[PDB]
Structures are given as C-alpha cells and as structure tokens.
A paper describes a structure:
The spike (S) glycoprotein of the coronavirus is a class I viral fusion protein located on the outer envelope of the virion that plays a critical role in viral infection by recognizing host cell receptors and mediating fusion of the viral and cellular membranes. The coronavirus S glycoprotein is synthesized as a precursor protein consisting of ~1,300 amino acids that is then cleaved into an amino (N)-terminal S1 subunit (~700 amino acids) and a carboxyl (C)-terminal S2 subunit (~600 amino acids). The S1 subunit contains a receptor-binding domain (RBD), while the S2 subunit contains a hydrophobic fusion peptide and two heptad repeat regions. Among these, CTD1 is the receptor-binding domain, and one CTD1 in the trimer adopts an “up” conformation as a prerequisite for the binding of SARS-CoV to the cellular receptor angiotensin-converting enzyme 2 (ACE2).
Cryo-EM analysis of the cleaved S glycoprotein showed an intact trimer in both the neutral-pH (pH 7.2) and the low-pH (pH 5.6) buffer. Our cryo-EM analysis of the SARS-CoV S glycoprotein and ACE2 complex sample captured three ACE2-bound and two ACE2-free conformational states of the trypsin-cleaved and low-pH-treated SARS-CoV S glycoprotein. The structure of the other ACE2-free state was determined at a resolution of 3.6 Å with C3 symmetry imposed. This ACE2-free state had all three CTD1s in the “down” position and was designated as the unbound-down conformation that is not accessible for receptor binding. Structural comparisons of the CTD1s from different ACE2-free conformational states showed that the “up” angles of the CTD1s were between 50° and 70°, while the angle for the CTD1s in the “down” position was approximately 22.7°. The S2’ cleavage site located in a surface pocket of the stem around Arg797 and covered by a “C”-shaped loop (residues 787–796) is inaccessible in both the unbound-down and the ACE2-bound SARS-CoV S glycoprotein structures. The “down” CTD1s are located immediately above the S2 subunits and have direct contact with helix linker 2 (left). The direct contact should stabilize the prefusion S2 subunit and prevent it from transitioning into the postfusion state.
Residue numbers in the entry:
A (entry chain A): 50 to 239, 244 to 289
B (entry chain B): 290 to 660, 674 to 722
C (entry chain B): 964 to 1119
D (entry chain A): 723 to 811, 832 to 1059
E (entry chain C): 723 to 770
Write the structure that this text describes.
C-alpha cells in the first residue's frame, strides 16, 4: 500500500508495437536488433514460440546464447554457434515430435551451459482461443541477462489487448556477451507450417514509473512519467 | 538543568530505550566447503580476453585464507573492508580470473581505463568486492619467451561493465574483413612477454576479481557463524543473512510472495522479514523508546519525583525495570504504583484521584499532577442556571479590580564580533 | 602548537564550519524571537494607544472587566499595565416585560434593554441597577398592541 | 532519527556538541506554546454551564449546535461533520525516531468548552465575561444585539417568526453546504497537509545518501572496518543533522504563523462570541448580530450570525 | 544556481536528496501567500 518511484528500464506506455503476424503464407523470422533490452509477447496455441538466439553478428564468430526447450525442460547454452538462415523445429502435426533438432551444429570455445528444472509442456498443433500468452522481458543490465515471465488468458481476434499484466523475476545469467542483433525460433509443422498465431516486439527506455502496490503486495496500476504532463504531474 | 533549586513543572530529560536481552542469528542450514582451494590455487589460468567466471554457491566461506598469508601481492578491496567480511551472507559469488603484466594492475579499479584495461576487461563502478593479485614469476615466466597467452589492443570502442569478447576479428577501420598483413589491416592480438630476469612491471601476475552479487536470492554463501533459535515478543539482537539490528519479533499477517526475502513498509523501513528456515515474521525493531520527563514538586516543599515514560504501554516498563533493562538505569528507584491511561504513557510514582483539581502540572492528555497525585482534570466550576422566562438578574453592587497585564516590548540588544 | 601545514587546514575548516553553523543557527533563532517580540511590541503599542490614551470598548482586550482606566508602568525589557476594570458582582431576580401596552399600542423602552416589570414599576439600565419612572420620555411610539410578550399599563 | 543506533556513531554525534539538546528544547517549547494556544482560545470560561436541554426559544432552535444526550457522543452534529471532513495523511511504535505527542486538552473536553460557550451565549445573559450571567431569555438578547447595529427594537418583536424561520433555514443551509461540498474548509486541511508533508519529507531525507557509500546505517556497518568508516558516518550525521535542523527551523516559523492565527482566534472569540464587536468586517461580513464557536480538528470554526440588508428604494431628503 | 550546468555535478546534487524540491515548494508557497496578501488587501469589492 505505497507508491514507489523508481528509475529502471521499462516499456513505455502506449508506444509502438512491431507486430509479426505469421500465417502459412507469411514466414516471420527475421533478424532484429537488440538495442538495450526488448519486450516480447506471443498469442499461441500449445507453446510454439520456444527459442531466442541473442547474437552479435549472427554467425560462427559471434558468442551467442540460445534459450529453447527440448519439450521437457529449458536448455540454455552459450557458445560459438554456426547460425543458419533457417533453424527450424520439425514438429509433426499428428504427434509433435521434434525429430530434427538441428540447432547445435558445431561447438568450440564454449563458455556456458545451463539446464533448468523440467516441467510439463505441450508441443503439437491446436486451435481455438488464444489461451496461451507469454509476456517476457529480455533485459540487459551490468553485463547480466534478465528474463522475466507473466501469464494472462485472453480471447482476441488478432490484436494485442489492453490491460496491465505484472511480470515476475525468473532468470538471471552471468554471460556478458555483446548482444546487438537477435532472432526467435518457431516451429515448422508437418512443407513448413504454423497456425493463426503471432508474436510481438517492443523496445525499452530508461524513464521513471510510479507503481501502485495494493495492501496484498501486487501492482494494480503503474503510471509513466515521461508520457503526458498529467502523467508527470501524477508521478510528481 | 544545572541548578540546586528546581522550580515546579514537567522538565524534559534524557531518552530511555530497552537494552536487548537475547541474541538471534539465523542462517540457512546449507553447510558446505568452498572451492577456494581450487579457484585461488589452480594450475591453468586463462588470458584476459577469455576471463573465466566461476559460479561459487551453496557454501560456507572462511574469509581467513585471504588474511593470514603474505603470499598475496595486492589485496585491495573496493566495496567492502577487510576484517568484517565474514559477517555477511552473499548469493552467487563470482570469481573473475585473468593474467596480466605488472603494469595493468594499476589500471584495475572503478574507472581509470587507460591502455589495456579498456579493450579487454571492463569493471563497473558500484558492484565491487575485492580485487586480488599475486606474483607468479616462478611458474609462468620463461626467460627464452612465453608466447602462449595473448590479449587485444585494437577494438572499435569501449566495453560495457562485465562484457567479454573472444572473437578474433580481422580489425579494420571500416568494417572490412581483411587479408592481413596488408596495409591498414592489422591483427588485434599481441603477446605478453613474461621473462625471468626482466623488470617488475613485466612479471606475470594472476589477478582474481571477486564480484560480490549482493543478495539477489535467499542467501547461500555464508561465513562460519552459529544459527541459534528465535525469541518472539522480546527485544533481541539480529544477524540474518544480510541484515542486523535490534528488534521485537512477532508472527505476521502477510501475503508474502515466494520469490522474495525482505518486507519493507510504506516509507522504506524493514518492518517484516522472512526466516531462512521457513518462517515469515514481522520486525517491530522499535523495542521501546521515548523520553522520560521528571514531574517534580519544586524542591522547596517536597523532594519526591515521578517519571513520565512517554511512548509505552506499562508492560515493557515493568518488565524492563524489574529485570533492569533501561538505559537511564537508576540506583534508588522502585515501582509500587503505576498509573496508566491517556496514552501519553507510563507514570511511575503517582496515584489516581477521583476529586479533580485545577490542573497544576500538565501531564500529556487530560491528566494533571499536583502536590504526588495524578488526577484527570477539573475543567472548571460546574454550574447550571435556571433558564425560565421574564425573571432577569441585574447586578446591584460592583467593585473595581485593578488586574495587572505584562507585555514584553524589546528583548536583549545583542551583537556578535564574527571575527572573534 | 602541534600542527604544521595543510593537514591543519582540515582541522581549522572543521572548526570554522561547525562554529559558523552554530552562529548561523543563533542568528536565525534570534531573528524568529525578534519577530515574536515585535508582534508583542505591536500589541503593546496598540494597548497603550487604546487603553491608556482613551477607553477601548472592545471586550476582554484591555482588562477583564469593562475597562474604566489604564496606567502604564516601566519594566525590565517590557511594559506592565494596570487595567482599572469594572466587575459587577451581585445578583437579584426581577421580572420583565419586553414591551409596554398603555393605550392600545406597544412601547419599546430606549434600546437600552430591560423594562422593569417588577410588578410594572420602572425601566432600568443593562448593567447597574437604577430605576427610572416610566414616562413618554423613556419610551417611543411603536406600532399597535399586537406583538408583545409582557404587559404593562398606565404609562402616565 | 540521527544515527539509528549502534555504539560509536553515538560518540561521533556527541563530538558535535549539544545539538540534540537544542532541538529537544525547541520542540518542547513549540509543544508548550501550542498547549498555551489551546488554553488561550477555548479556556476563557471560568464558570462552565450546562446545556439547558430545551433548545427551542421563539423558534431559534439550537438543534445540531448544542449537543444531545440521546446520541452517544457529547458533541453536536455540525461538529461531527467538521470532524468527518478533515482527512489525515495501544501506542504507536515506529523507528523513524519521530512521534506525535497527544494534545493536553482532550477533544471531548474541547467539545465541552464549546458547548459551554454556546450554552452561555444562548442562555446566561449578555454580561458574559465581566461577571457570570444575567438569565436573559434570548429574545431580549437579540433585541439588545439589534442596538449595536443602528436599528430600533421594532425589528425583532415585529418579525419574531420571520427571523426565526430565516435563522433556522440559515442553519439548515449551513448543514447542506458543509456535507457534499468542497475546499471551503481549506485552512485546516492546509495545516494538516503541511505538517504531513514536512514529516514525510523528513522521513524521505532518511532514505537518501548525503555523499556516503550507502544511505543507511547497520548495512554499511557490515562492510566497514575503521576510521575510513568515520568519514562515511560523519557525512551521514552531517546531512541528517542539517535536514533535522531545517525541519526544526521551519516548524518554528509555522508555529509563529499558527500562534498569530491563534491570537486572532482568541481575539475573535473574546470580541464576537462574548459580546458584539462593532468593528466593521472583522467578525463576519454583515453587521454581526451573534457568533457561535464550534470545535474542529486542530482549529476552530465560527458561525457569524450577520445582518445583510438587501432591498433598495429611492427617497428624497 | 547550485551547480551551473554540466552533467555529473547534477549527479552529485541528486546525491543530497530532494533539497531542490523543498526549496521550490517553499518559494512557490511564498509566492502564493503574496498573491493571497494582494487579494486580501485590495479585493474587498464585489461590486466595482
């Protein structure tokens, strides 16, 4: 039950969204610049969007990290990675078995590997409402790598709904690599394929926010400072 | 008040506080022995451009092999001091090792990048522990030439804090993957030159940077202390994982989230904690304080006084005096009677009086002393008047009442010679 | 005695900074006391120009009574007045009429209240008991005999 | 407040002289002056009267002004509205070091003083002050208050019912214009908000560094050893001492302003309430027929019964 | 007034807390009280 002004790299309110609406005609997996921490979200059906390749020049001479799933557990390895023009998840349509996880091509001068706790995870193709919805923050600070997490069940036609969704501090990494450009990894159904699902990108900016904690200890409202003169009046 | 004669009234005096009785130290039950005999004593050490970052966690550090030894050349700590280093519990301490000359240790600090310590190994300015370096001129140094370990000296720009590059790029001022040794296309690599009978600045040093990741979790790495039991509802001392102090502990009514360890209030004070062995207790660290204020009759009619403890509830006071806990600990002082209402606090040495008087001495809230007694207050002469119709009182006789009235007009005309 | 050079200037800067903060605290608190004492001085000049140089009818300002006279006296760093007041202390219980109805029309006394209907005898003052005989000089024509509460006849 | 507690920081505080004694003397003097303010304003009654429990005199009814025994509180209803309006921003136990001492004159005793004043205004004559009472039936009172105004006595007894209805509708419009309304109780809210902003600013100055390593004691006291620590603790003590001294000076200035307003309040309660003050635009806005004090959180609220004549003819002279 | 302008002196000023906010609140309060003074003295006329 307080109000806590803090200066920290957040997502600004109301700002621009680089939406990637992939369909069976549109294969959305380009290279994206990192630029001091990003936002991420994905309206999905049974967890397609495992995979993030945070690189420098996206080739063999670039120390990069990979955050994927082997359908059982989160696997994080950072080493020199021969990054191809399309690494893909060969997810079958009747079953969903990644037979050809072909990502770790070669490995030399390796410096890191981490395997987290295993948990239940769905792979194969589904349809219906946009029940699965990740919201991640891939933040860079003091050489570390910060990865947060939060969930919200939605049912939207094709856009990003409006509403607050608090995130929670899962991961911290000791890596320290020159993350300038990156990509994501999707699943190629089986000829590739996805369902009517999309994933989003937002950029961070160092400005001041006023977080309104409740009596139970949960954010119910946040107010940016650098948005509106009424907003800086609120956080002043 | 620096006098022998003391006039009648509440006079302010010193401040009381309950001295803590117990002593509560709470560390987690993780007990383990650190790899400090391996990370500080190893055979293979990397170069600067591939400095190794070892995760050291779930241990009990000693912090005594670093001190009782003259083997170390430069033991300079930055964020902490020496002797009281084993009083804290850290979380995921990281050891950063690399091998330089005798000159680059002067460039290892928050700031002062200079020549070699900018392109190769960049330090932050806040999150620092201790930087340790010792001489190893009798292992790595060969007089015929040790061309094994390298560094970089040509990179487009600086580094962010704790950032590392291994990638052997064919350096060029315009991108340009070159074919060296062509003109304006040099290599970034270079050898060290560790020799035996050379100068002191050309001798091999092993530099180990102990980054202290201060408490981003329930703490794992600790020092050799002894975790004791808890004492609730009694003023004790503290040593938790990253917190000391003095407090009165009690079970909470919190909704504490599982990723979390500390519980600060609306205005930045601790007020609640999480025990390292599965408990979530509040922290009312104000055991008791306030200020005593001696009610005295005036040293010309009587000499029996009464102390007014201001912010208490007359349970910590009686327990504090009968167990001799207070900081104005007297010698001739006991407690036979204890008046307590009107929340301005304990009043030792007084008696309730139902017959309210004209409020000689103003104790706190309503209650007023005299003579010693402590009644509430007679607000005035109580009255009730016959308020019918046309009957009316006219004064018939009068008096003349010359009443004084005192007004100050001019205080002391002073001046200050502000050069003496 | 036991200092030599610029290490001494640290000590002397500490002493000058501390004594300067203490002297500045003194000057600020004396300035606030001077503001309070000039508010009391303006009260004193006001009382000496109201009470002493005349008779100030404002209630409970000069004295406690009705302020008959006032006498200033000197004092060390101040002034002491002697407010000659007027405290009436006895009480009777007489009855009243808020009007007089003599011939068929009401009579209000002198604005200057308490008609004395102590069995319909006189008209007195507000403060000191002083009966005066009811005539037409002590009253005035007022309306008709329709809005009264008390009744007095035979105004002669 | 300064120097949270350890052992040695206390020695570093004692090496700055007796500033703690100065600040305690200044704040205790401020507390005593505010006790004197509440004694000066309210406690002008030697002879405390009782509520007459009739409360209807010619239609001038004092419902919601004099308290009622049928309700559990000894206030009145307008006092209840004024107590409910002003929001705020066992014994409390917080380790700021700060506190709020309780006032001397209790809130129910303040309401008793105000009920005594209103009851002695309505009953108990006009000679109230220099004496005790006169037992004047309150129509004779406002017949007398119609003589320090320059009108005759023909106004009141010929317009008894009209002035009674106007007076009761005026009290009822006060009852309307206090409840659902807004900023026109703003002085008391400004007092409470300025005190809360000063104290929260002091707590906020606890949060900040003043040039040391970290902004809190007992957490620097882990990673420090010796005299290098005394530099950090001297920086923190000097900064917190300047902030606390700033607080004491600004509270002393606010105390000077609030005792000027307290002397105005005591003057108005001894002019307006205890008589009829003919000085123009001091008590009310009209010609000041009566006046009624009411209690308030950290203040006082008057109800100046004035006399506003509003019609105009055009006669020759 | 304090700290003319560069970049880093501003950080050294922010390491003294919120004194600039205190002084701005105090001087704006003084300005508002002087506006209130001029409204109290002169503006006693509703019907100009």
């Amino acid at each position: 039950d307080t109000l806590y002004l803090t200066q920290d790299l957040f997502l600004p309110f109301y700002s621009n969204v680089t939406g990637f609406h992939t369909i069976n005609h549109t294969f959305g997996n380009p290279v994206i610049p990192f630029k001091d921490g990003i936002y991420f979200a994905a309206t999905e059906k049974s967890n397609v969007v495992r995979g993030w390749v945070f690189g420098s020049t996206m080739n063999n001479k670039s120390q990069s990290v990979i955050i994927i799933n082997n359908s059982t557990n989160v696997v994080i390895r950072a080493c020199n990675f021969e990054l191809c023009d399309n690494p893909f998840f060969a997810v079958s349509k009747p079953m969903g078995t990644q037979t050809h996880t072909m990502i770790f091509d070669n490995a030399f001068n390796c410096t890191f590997e981490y395997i987290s706790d295993a948990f239940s995870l769905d792979v194969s193709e589904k349809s219906g409402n946009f029940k699965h919805l990740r919201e991640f923050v891939f933040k860079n600070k003091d050489g570390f790598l910060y990865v947060y997490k939060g969930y919200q069940p939605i049912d939207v036609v094709r856009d990003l709904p409006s509403g607050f969704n608090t995130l929670k501090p899962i991961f911290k990494l000791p890596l320290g690599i020159n993350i300038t450009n990156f990509r994501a990894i999707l699943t190629a159904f089986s000829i590739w394929g996805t369902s009517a699902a999309a994933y989003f990108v937002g950029y961070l900016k160092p400005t001041t926010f006023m977080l309104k904690y409740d009596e139970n200890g949960t954010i119910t409202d946040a107010v940016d400072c650098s948005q509106n003169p009424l907003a800086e009046l609120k956080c002043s | 008040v620096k006098s022998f004669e003391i006039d009648k009234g509440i006079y302010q005096t010193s401040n009381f506080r309950v001295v803590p009785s117990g002593d509560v130290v709470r560390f987690p039950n993780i007990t383990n022995l650190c790899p400090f005999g391996e990370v500080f004593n190893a055979t293979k050490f990397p170069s600067v451009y591939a400095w190794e970052r070892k995760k050291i966690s779930n241990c009990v550090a000693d912090y005594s092999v670093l001190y009782n030894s003259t083997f170390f050349s430069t033991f300079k700590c930055y964020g902490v001091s020496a002797t009281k280093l084993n009083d804290l519990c850290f979380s995921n301490v990281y050891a950063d090792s690399f091998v330089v000359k005798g000159d680059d240790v002067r460039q290892i600090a928050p700031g002062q990048t200079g020549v070699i310590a900018d392109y190769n190994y960049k330090l932050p300015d806040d999150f620092m522990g201790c930087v340790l370096a010792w001489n190893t001129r009798n292992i790595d140094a060969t007089s015929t030439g040790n061309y094994n370990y390298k560094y970089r000296y040509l990179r487009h720009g600086k580094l962010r804090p704790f950032e590392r590059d291994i990638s052997n790029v064919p350096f060029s001022p315009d991108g340009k993957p070159c074919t060296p040794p062509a003109l304006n296309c040099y290599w970034p690599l270079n050898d060290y030159g560790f020799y035996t009978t050379t100068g002191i600045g050309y001798q091999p040093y092993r530099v180990v940077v102990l980054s202290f990741e201060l408490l981003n979790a329930p703490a794992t790495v600790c020092g050799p202390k002894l975790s004791t039991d808890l004492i609730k509802n009694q003023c004790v001392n503290f040593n938790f994982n990253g917190l000391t102090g003095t407090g009165v502990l009690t079970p909470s009514s919190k909704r504490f989230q599982p990723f979390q360890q500390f519980g600060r209030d609306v205005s930045d004070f601790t007020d609640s904690v999480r025990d390292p062995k599965t408990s979530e207790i509040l922290d009312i660290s104000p055991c008791s304080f306030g200020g005593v204020s001696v009610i005295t009759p005036g040293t010309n009619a009587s000499s029996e006084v009464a102390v007014l403890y201001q912010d208490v509830n007359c349970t910590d006071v009686s327990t504090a005096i009968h167990a001799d806990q207070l900081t104005p600990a007297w010698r001739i002082y006991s407690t036979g009677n204890n008046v307590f209402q009107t929340q301005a606090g304990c009043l030792i040495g007084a008696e309730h009086v139902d017959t309210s008087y004209e409020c000689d001495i103003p104790i706190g809230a309503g209650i007023c002393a005299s003579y010693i007694v402590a009644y509430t207050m007679s607000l005035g002469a109580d009255s009730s008047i016959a308020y019918s119709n046309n009957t009316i009182a006219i004064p018939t006789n009068f008096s003349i009442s010359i009443t004084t009235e005192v007004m100050p007009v001019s205080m002391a005309k002073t001046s200050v010679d502000c050069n003496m | 005695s036991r200092l030599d050079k610029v290490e001494a200037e640290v000590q002397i800067d500490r002493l000058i900074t501390g004594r300067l903060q203490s002297l500045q605290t003194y000057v600020t608190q004396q300035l606030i006391r001077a503001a309070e004492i000039r508010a009391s001085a303006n009260l004193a000049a006001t009382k000496m120009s109201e009470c002493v140089l005349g008779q100030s009818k404002r209630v409970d300002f000069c004295g406690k009574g009705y302020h008959l006279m006032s006498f200033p006296q000197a004092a060390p760093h101040g002034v002491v007045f002697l407010h000659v007041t007027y405290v009436p202390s006895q009480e009777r219980n007489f009855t009243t009429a808020p009007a007089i109805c003599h011939e068929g029309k009401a009579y209000f006394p002198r604005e200057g209240v308490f008609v004395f209907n102590g069995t319909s005898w006189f008209i007195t003052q507000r403060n000191f008991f002083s009966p005066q005989i009811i005539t037409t000089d002590n009253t005035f024509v007022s309306g008709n005999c329709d809005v009264v509460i008390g009744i007095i006849n035979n105004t002669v | 407040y300064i120097c949270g507690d350890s052992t040695e920081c206390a020695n570093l505080l004692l090496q700055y002289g007796s500033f703690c004694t100065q600040l305690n003397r200044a704040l205790s003097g401020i507390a005593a002056e505010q006790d004197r303010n509440t004694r000066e304003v309210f406690a002008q009654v030697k002879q405390m009267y009782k509520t007459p429990t009739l409360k209807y005199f010619g239609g001038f009814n004092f419902s919601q002004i004099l308290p009622d025994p049928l309700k559990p509180t000894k206030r009145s209803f307008i006092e209840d509205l004024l107590f409910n309006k002003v929001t705020l921003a066992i014994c409390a136990q917080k380790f700021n070091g700060l506190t709020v001492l309780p006032p001397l004159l209790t809130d129910d005793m303040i309401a008793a003083y105000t009920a005594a004043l209103v009851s002695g205004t309505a009953t108990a004559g006009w000679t109230f002050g220099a004496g005790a009472a006169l037992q004047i039936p309150f129509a004779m009172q406002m017949a007398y208050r119609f003589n320090g105004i320059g009108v005759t006595q023909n106004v009141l007894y010929e317009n008894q019912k009209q002035i009674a209805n106007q007076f009761n509708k005026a009290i009822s419009q006060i009852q309307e214009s206090l409840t659902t309304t807004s900023t026109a109780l703003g002085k008391l809210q400004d007092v409470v908000n300025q005190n809360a902003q000063a104290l929260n600013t002091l707590v906020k100055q606890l949060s900040s560094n003043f040039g040391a390593i970290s902004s809190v004691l007992n957490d620097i006291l882990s990673r420090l050893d010796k005299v290098e620590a005394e530099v950090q603790i001297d920086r923190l003590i000097t900064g917190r001492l300047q902030s606390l001294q700033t607080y004491v000076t600004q509270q002393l200035i606010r105390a000077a302003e609030i005792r000027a307003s307290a002397n105005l309040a005591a003057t108005k309660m001894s002019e307006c309430v205890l008589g009829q003050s003919k000085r123009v635009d001091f008590c009310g806005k009209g010609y000041h027929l009566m006046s009624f004090p009411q209690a308030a959180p950290h203040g006082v609220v008057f109800l100046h019964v004035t006399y506003v004549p509003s019609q105009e003819r055009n006669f020759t002279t």
